[PDB]
Point group: D2
Chain length 116, copies 4
């Protein structure tokens, strides 16, 4: 799994379950092309977005649909989404974990990058 997303809820002290995530890759013409999408499991994890073959070099945007998450819980949050934008695989293949910790008016995000 070369790209995994993990989301935690700082209000509940739990995984953030059923969070929609959309990944985009910047195209040659500088537009954001849809790359992959999914939603977090009961563990707060999203696996299986892509493959080593398909996850080529590029600039990627991981959009975590935080507003949709909070609204589904009946809470009115501040942000539309959390965006994580990074160059990937430019020194060869790596494995990326994008983690996020959510509150209604705040979030934090980090990356764990490993070389297989």
């Amino acid at each position: 799994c070369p790209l995994m997303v993990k989301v935690l809820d700082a209000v509940r002290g739990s995984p953030a379950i059923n969070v929609a995530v959309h990944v985009f890759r910047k195209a040659a013409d500088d537009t954001w092309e849809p790359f992959a999408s999914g939603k977090t499991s009961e563990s707060g994890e999203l696996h299986g977005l892509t493959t080593e073959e398909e996850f080529v070099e590029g600039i990627y945007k991981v959009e975590i649909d935080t507003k949709s998450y909070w609204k589904a819980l009946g809470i009115s949050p501040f942000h539309e989404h959390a965006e994580v934008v990074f160059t990937a695989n430019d020194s060869g293949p790596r494995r990326y974990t994008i983690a996020a910790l959510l509150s209604p008016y705040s979030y934090s995000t980090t990356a764990v990058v490993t070389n297989p």
Copy 2:
């Protein structure tokens, strides 16, 4: 000052000085229209972006040029930039502070919305 941006550096324990910040407003066609920009001051703050008259309800994006910041300090960073996307809503308090706390592979952001 209806909109202020504050940026802090978690590596050095300091304000993040001379960071470029661009604000965009979402247009009807879903494109991002330039709105305001500037560079953070010696205190890590960017004041004077807009006025009450100009800062109408809508969706805004604050893009913080973190990559250039880290590179100017000789540090290799992960992100291209940090983004903060939110709706300005007149039913809530009137002053928005968007704060960001930067590390090479991570950032935190919060909103402080007051009257």
Copy 3:
């Protein structure tokens, strides 16, 4: 003002107002000696804790009473308090801001140390 404490609320998007804060200094016998205390203001800040004369090098602990804060808002929190433990060092910059960003099951803290 050599030491200031700032507290923000990540649930409401606001300063964290009327939060009790206690500062301790580590004594020679490794016990924590009361040093300064107060409650955060309407802006989430606590100024006036100490003076340059009193704030000598050493290990300090800033304890933020997060549990009472959340309970007063009707929210069940995880932590008993938030703690920030650090060394004041005269070789570095002279003004310390300890900032904390609170959620019910989480907190973030940073230091902004300037001249």
Copy 4:
């Protein structure tokens, strides 16, 4: 595993390996009694601190030795340690994950609490 600690490094984008962790429990006389200790693995995780039998109700302090971590990497950090203090198991047994994300002048921490 009723108590697990996980530590990530926000500078390197990696697990925080070899981080010492000391857990204390508040005694009847209000002192902090040593409860358990260990260090994070190559995954940034620390397992096996305690057992369901031993992890009774109480107020616990998880001290993550961040200064020692950063100093071993040759960096002069701000904090002495990160302390996480909480009441545990007061509504019956739970499983607690204490996570921390470290930078030289900052850290964040969260809890994931689950009911087995």
